[PDB]
Each structure stands twice: as structure tokens, then as C-alpha cells.
Amino acid sequence: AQQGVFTLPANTSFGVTAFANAANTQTIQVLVDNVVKATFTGSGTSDKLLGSQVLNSGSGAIKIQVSVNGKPSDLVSNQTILANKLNFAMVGSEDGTDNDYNDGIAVLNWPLG
Amino acid sequence: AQQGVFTLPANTSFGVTAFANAANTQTIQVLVDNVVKATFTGSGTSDKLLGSQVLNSGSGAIKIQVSVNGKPSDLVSNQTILANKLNFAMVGSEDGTDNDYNDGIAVLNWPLG
Amino acid sequence: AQQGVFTLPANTSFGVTAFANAANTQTIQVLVDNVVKATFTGSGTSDKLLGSQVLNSGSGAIKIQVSVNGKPSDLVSNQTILANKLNFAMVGSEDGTDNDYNDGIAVLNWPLG
Amino acid sequence: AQQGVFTLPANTSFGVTAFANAANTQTIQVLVDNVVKATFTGSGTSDKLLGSQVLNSGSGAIKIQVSVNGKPSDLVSNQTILANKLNFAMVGSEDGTDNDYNDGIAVLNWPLG
Ligand SMILES: CO[C@H]1O[C@H](CO)[C@@H](O)[C@H](O)[C@@H]1O
Ligand SMILES: CO[C@H]1O[C@H](CO)[C@@H](O)[C@H](O)[C@@H]1O
Ligand SMILES: CO[C@H]1O[C@H](CO)[C@@H](O)[C@H](O)[C@@H]1O
Ligand SMILES: CO[C@H]1O[C@H](CO)[C@@H](O)[C@H](O)[C@@H]1O
Ligand SMILES: [Ca+2]
Ligand SMILES: [Ca+2]
Ligand SMILES: [Ca+2]
Ligand SMILES: [Ca+2]
Ligand SMILES: [Ca+2]
Ligand SMILES: [Ca+2]
Ligand SMILES: [Ca+2]
Ligand SMILES: [Ca+2]
Numbered sequence: 001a002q003q004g005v006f007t008l009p010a011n012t013s014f015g016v017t018a019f020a021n022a023a024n025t026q027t028i029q030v031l032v033d034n035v036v037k038a039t040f041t042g043s044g045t046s047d048k049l050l051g052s053q054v055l056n057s058g059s060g061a062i063k064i065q066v067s068v069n070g071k072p073s074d075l076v077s078n079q080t081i082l083a084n085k086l087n088f089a090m091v092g093s094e095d096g097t098d099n100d101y102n103d104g105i106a107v108l109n110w111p112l113g
Numbered sequence: 114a115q116q117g118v119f120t121l122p123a124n125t126s127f128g129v130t131a132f133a134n135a136a137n138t139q140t141i142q143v144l145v146d147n148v149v150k151a152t153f154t155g156s157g158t159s160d161k162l163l164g165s166q167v168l169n170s171g172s173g174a175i176k177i178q179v180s181v182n183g184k185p186s187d188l189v190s191n192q193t194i195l196a197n198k199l200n201f202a203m204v205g206s207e208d209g210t211d212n213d214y215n216d217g218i219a220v221l222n223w224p225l226g
Numbered sequence: 227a228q229q230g231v232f233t234l235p236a237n238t239s240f241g242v243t244a245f246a247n248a249a250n251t252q253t254i255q256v257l258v259d260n261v262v263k264a265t266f267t268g269s270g271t272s273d274k275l276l277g278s279q280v281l282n283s284g285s286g287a288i289k290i291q292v293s294v295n296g297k298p299s300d301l302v303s304n305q306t307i308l309a310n311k312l313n314f315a316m317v318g319s320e321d322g323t324d325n326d327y328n329d330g331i332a333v334l335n336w337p338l339g
Numbered sequence: 340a341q342q343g344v345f346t347l348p349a350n351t352s353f354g355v356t357a358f359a360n361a362a363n364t365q366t367i368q369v370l371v372d373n374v375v376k377a378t379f380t381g382s383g384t385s386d387k388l389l390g391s392q393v394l395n396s397g398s399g400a401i402k403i404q405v406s407v408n409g410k411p412s413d414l415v416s417n418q419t420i421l422a423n424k425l426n427f428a429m430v431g432s433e434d435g436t437d438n439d440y441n442d443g444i445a446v447l448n449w450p451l452g
Contacts, residue, residue, distance in 0.1 A: 001309040001415045001433065001440065003340075015160030017130060021225045047128030047225050049165045076196045076340045078417045079307040082205050083189045083227040086214040092199040094340065100224060101199040101340065107220055111213060112134045112160050114229075114302045114320065114327065114422040189227045191304045194418040196340040207227065214227065241386030243356060247451045273354030273451050275391045302422045309415045312431040312440040318421050326450060327425040333446055337439060338360045338386050 003075040004064040006089045006108065008057040014110035017052040020044050022068075024095055026104035029065040032058040040106075054112065066093040066104040076101055087111070116188040117177040119202045119221065121170040127223035130165040133157050135181075137208055139217035142178040145171040153219075167225065179206040179217040189214055200224070229301040230290040232315045232334065234283040240336035243278040246270050248294075250321055252330035255291040258284040266332075280338065292319040292330040302327055313337070342414040343403040345428045345447065347396040353449035356391040359383050361407075363434055365443035368404040371397040379445075393451065405432040405443040415440055426450070 008014060018028045018040035030038040032055060040050035066073040073093035081087050089108040092101040121127060131141045131153035143151040145168060153163035179186040186206035194200050202221040205214040234240060244254045244266035256264040258281060266276035292299040299319035307313050315334040318327040347353060357367045357379035369377040371394060379389035405412040412432035420426050428447040431440040 001342075001413055001438075003309075005310050007310055013159065015132065017162070017220075019128065019222070045226050046126065046167050047165065047222065049130070052160065052162045054159050074340055076199065078193060078195060079310070080191060080193055080203070080419065081305040081307075082191060082203065083207075083212070083214045083229075084231050084233055084305070085212065086189065086203075086205040086218075088201070088203050088220070090193070090195065090199075090201050092195050094196075099196070099198065099340075100226065101196045102222070102224060102226070105199075105222065107130075107201070107222075109132070109160065109215070109218065109220075111215060113158050113213065113215070114300055114325075116227075116422075118423050120423055187227055192420040192423070193306065194420075196342075197344050197346055197418070212227075239385065241358065243388070243446075245354065245448070271452050272352065272393050273391065273448065275356070278386065278388045280385050302425065304419060304421060306417060306419055306429070308417060308429065308431050309433075309438070309440045311438065312415065312429075312444075314427070314429050314446070316419070316421065316425075316427050318425040320422075325422070325424065326452065327422045328448070328450060328452070331425075331448065333356075333427070333448075335358070335386065335441070335444065335446075337441060339384050339439065339441070 003077040004091050006062045006079055008060040008062055010060040012057045012110055013054055013112045014057055014108055015054050016106055016108045018050040019105040020048040020050055021102040024068045027067045028104045028106055031063040033061050064091045064106045068095045116190040117204050119175045119192055121173040121175055123173040125170045125223055126167055126225045127170055127221055128167050129219055129221045131163040132218040133161040133163055134215040135208060137181045140180045141217045141219055144176040146174050177204045177219045181208045229303040230317050232288045232305055234286040234288055236286040238283045238336055239280055239338045240283055240334055241280050242332055242334045244276040245331040246274040246276055247328040248321060250294045253293045254330045254332055257289040259287050290317045290332045294321045342416040343430050345401045345418055347399040347401055349399040351396045351449055352393055352451045353396055353447055354393050355445055355447045357389040358444040359387040359389055360441040363407045366406045367443045367445055370402040372400050403430045403445045407434045
């Protein structure tokens with residue numbers, strides 16, 4: 001299945017926060033309506049915080065991509081809703097063979113405010 | 114039900130990252146075996162990143178507390194596992210009456226490496 | 227926080243399946259726009275299947291209630307989305323003191339077809 | 340990523356419940372330590388309940404397979420934990436091209452009792 005693709009409510013601010021747990025440099029891109037709006041880059045094996053940004057969801061079509069030196073990683077994702085209000089969309093990824101799936105991570109949350 | 118309580122694997126590094134979406138100052142505490150090991154403090158209504166830290170899970174007993182000026186907030190939480198390997202534990206909280214449950218948020222992830 | 231409340235897409239068929247893991251008779255009600263549309267009743271401590279039904283979501287306002295002989299149980303819930311398409315909404319409940327939260331369970335899934 | 344694979348606690352009873360939302364006959368197998376312990380078979384496009392069974396988790400290694408006339412479907416899965424106690428493991432699958440991922444579904448829950 002396609003992973004890293006999420007439908008958000010339209011025209012809604014959301015936070016996205018990216019991490020590495022990898023020896024290799026991760027490139028984590030956040031696309032809104034197929035346009036890259038944020039890119040997070042780095043490495044480190046202890047939950048290196050690569051950055052956190054607030055973006056508008058546009059039509060609501062979000063796609064997260066993770067790659068290492070142009071090679072796409074294998075993604076896994078889901079979305080969970082707490083209290084029928086608080087949304088998290090999580091992306092992990094595997095750049096190698098150990099299948100820890102933590103190499104490049106994105107966490108999205110909404111609504112803000 | 115009790116919320117914000119999670120059983121992690123013992124003696125395992127995990128990341129915890131905290132956010133505010135609130136006018137009021139949030140105090141987000143991370144307890145490992147009933148001992149506060151990290152405290153994140155601040156306010157802001159656009160997913161203000163309060164900090165991110167890596168901690169050892171001790172016996173595995175983790176509890177997240179959120180309060181505003183000593184008054185405990187109402188918490189909501191869960192844990193989700195992707196690819197039978199990548200764990201996220203999420204905590205939201207409500208300090209008021211609008212029931213957005215985003216006022217003080219913690220996201221935990223493991224394993225690292 | 228309120229638990230057992232979910233916003234579904236409007237005018238959409240969904241499945242709801244109920245279980246007991248309890249010595250006491252569970253009453254599990256499914257409300258659509260505040261109207262009870264299904265009721266599941268029974269006991270048994272080995273995941274007794276109480277029934278499964280397909281309902282229309284109406285406006286999308288779903289609420290699950292669980293009670294034992296008229297006394298509301300303590301509910302816990304969330305919603306998770308797989309492949310940006312397949313939705314599950316889960317409800318557990320505690321009628322007593324052992325805090326297994328499995329006493330009366332509802333699982334909702336959509337879309338069908 | 341591998342999907343449909345879950346690590347349960349060892350020697351623990353769990354429930355598994357299977358559904359179809361498909362024109363084609365689904366075959367949903369539940370393996371415990373690589374041994375098929377339950378098989379659910381059928382079709383129907385309105386959340387047809389194919390069956391529900393309680394099994395022992397053995398070492399804890401569970402794998403769900405879904406196929407149509409011997410052809411493996413594309414699986415998606417995750418696991419979620421409520422109240423730090425109630426576990427659900429969900430599997431959806433796609434046998435075709437419409438990518439509804441609802442064609443053959445398994446829901447596992449534990450602990451029972
Ligand atoms: C050296 O091992 C690490 O780095 C590689 C490459 O990034 C990852 O796949 C792996 O999980 C570890 O984090
Ligand atoms: C002024 O409204 C905001 O601040 C209060 C108090 O922190 C929160 O409960 C609320 O959701 C908003 O974020
Ligand atoms: C006798 O113990 C059982 O029944 C009670 C009452 O229903 C439940 O709370 C409990 O978890 C067990 O399933
Ligand atoms: C005819 O369409 C249905 O049946 C096919 C084959 O099973 C599924 O893939 C599809 O989602 C529908 O449920
Ligand atoms: Ca890896
Ligand atoms: Ca790694
Ligand atoms: Ca609030
Ligand atoms: Ca808020
Ligand atoms: Ca109980
Ligand atoms: Ca019980
Ligand atoms: Ca299909
Ligand atoms: Ca289908």
C-alpha cells in the first residue's frame with residue numbers, strides 16, 4: 001500500500017516534526033498538494049530532532065517522502081484520533097536492512113490553536 | 114480511565130517531545146518509575162516546541178503529567194505500533210473548556226538507534 | 227475526556243461489532259444522531275461475540291454507550307486510519323475494579339463495499 | 340514493510356474476528372508460530388462477518404495472511420493500545436485496484452477474561 005499519504009481538513013494549520021535515528025543523512029519532505037513545503041535533513045542515532053514547522057494544509061492532500069541521497073526509503077504510516085478531536089499522523093521509514101523503521105520519522109499534529 | 118501511563122520495555126532509550134497550543138503556561142512532566150526525569154514548560158498557540166529529550170525507560174513504567182500553575186489538566190492518550198517495531202505513545206490535554214485537547218502534548222517514540 | 231464519541235462521514239454505511247469479556251451482562255448501544263440504532267447484550271469472559279450490524283451514519287455523529295444494569299461503565303476509545311482509507315473506531319470499557327477495560331467492547335469499521 | 344505480523348504476549352488468549360467487503364472469496368488465515376490455527380473464508384460487500392475465534396498466542400508470534408484463490412492480497416496493519424491495557428491489532432487488505440483496503444479484514448483483541 002501507499003504509505004505517508006494523509007488527507008487533512010482543508011485550509012488548516014498543522015505541525016510537522018521530523019527526527020533521525022540513522023547513520024545516514026535523511027531527507028524528509030512534506031508535500032502539500034504535491035508541492036514540497038518543508039524539508040528536514042540530518043542524521044544521528046539518538047532521536048535527532050531535525051526541525052518542527054507549522055504549515056497550511058491547502059486542499060488537505062499531504063504526502064511525506066523520506067530518502068537518503070535520492071534513494072527513497074521504505075515508509076510505514078498511520079493516523080490516529082484522540083477524543084474525537086486531536087489528530088496525529090505518524091511516518092517511520094527504513095533506509096537499510098535492520099528493519100527498525102525509525103531512520104527518518106515525521107509526526108504531524110492538528111488542530112493547533 | 115487513567116491516561117498518560119505507558120509500559121515501555123525496560124532499560125530502553127526513548128525520545129519524548131513536548132508542544133503547547135495554549136495561551137496558558139503548560140508544565141509537562143515525564144516520570145520514569147514515579148520520578149520526574151524531564152520537565153517542559155511554555156505557552157504558544159502554534160505548536161510551540163517546548164523541547165525534546167532522550168531518556169532511559171527504567172523498569173518501563175512511564176507516566177506523563179500535564180498541569181497549568183499546579184492544576185492538573187484533563188489527559189487523553191494512546192499507544193500505536195507500526196511495522197511491529199516502531200512505537201509512538203501520544204498524550205494530549207485540555208486545560209480549559211474548548212475541548213481541543215491540544216493544550217500540552219507529549220509524543221514519545223522508541224526504539225531509537 | 228468524553229470517550230466513545232466519533233465523527234464519521236455523513237450518510238455512510240459502517241459496521242459495528244460488539245464483544246463481552248465479563249461476568250456481568252453488558253449493554254452496548256450504538257447511537258446515530260442521539261438515537262439508539264443497535265443494542266448488543268450479553269456476558270461471557272472469552273470474547274463472546276454479541277453481534278455485528280451495518281448501520282447508516284446519518285449526519286456522522288456516532289456515540290457508543292456501555293452499561294451494566296443501567297449503570298454506565300467507564301469508557302476508553304480511539305480512531306485509527308490505515309492506508310488513508312480504512313477506518314477503525316474502538317471502544318473498551320470497565321464495569322468494575324480490575325481495570326482490564328475489556329468488559330464491553332465495540333469495534334466500528336468503514337468504508338464498506 | 341511486512342504487514343500483518345504482530346508480537347503478542349506469550350501463552351495469552353486472544354480473539355480474532357474476520358470480515359469481507361468484497362465480491363471475491365477471501366481466505367483469511369491466522370498463524371501462531373508459523374502454524375495456521377484458524378481460517379476464515381467468504382465474500383460479501385456489507386461487512387460480512389466470516390467468524391470469530393479465540394486462540395492461544397503460543398510464543399507470541401502471530402501472522403495474518405489474506406489471499407483470494409491462492410493469490411496474496413496487499414496488506415496494511417497496525418496495533419493500538421488503550422488505557423495501557425486493551426490491545427487491538429487490525430489488518431486490512433486489497434485484492435484488486437480500487438484501493439479500499441477493506442476486502443478481507445482481521446481484528447485481534449487481547450487480553451480476554
Ligand atoms: C549503522 O546503522 C544505523 O544506520 C543505518 C543507516 O542509516 C540504519 O538503517 C540503522 O537502523 C541504524 O540506525
Ligand atoms: C485562549 O484560548 C487558548 O488558550 C486556552 C488556555 O490555555 C486553551 O484551553 C485553548 O484551547 C486555546 O489554546
Ligand atoms: C469476575 O470478573 C469478571 O467480570 C467482571 C464484572 O463483569 C469484570 O469487570 C472483570 O474484568 C472480569 O471480566
Ligand atoms: C466488485 O468490487 C468489489 O469486489 C472487489 C473484488 O473482491 C474488491 O476489490 C472491491 O473493493 C469491491 O469490494
Ligand atoms: Ca534502519
Ligand atoms: Ca535506525
Ligand atoms: Ca483547550
Ligand atoms: Ca488549545
Ligand atoms: Ca473489568
Ligand atoms: Ca473483563
Ligand atoms: Ca478492494
Ligand atoms: Ca472492497
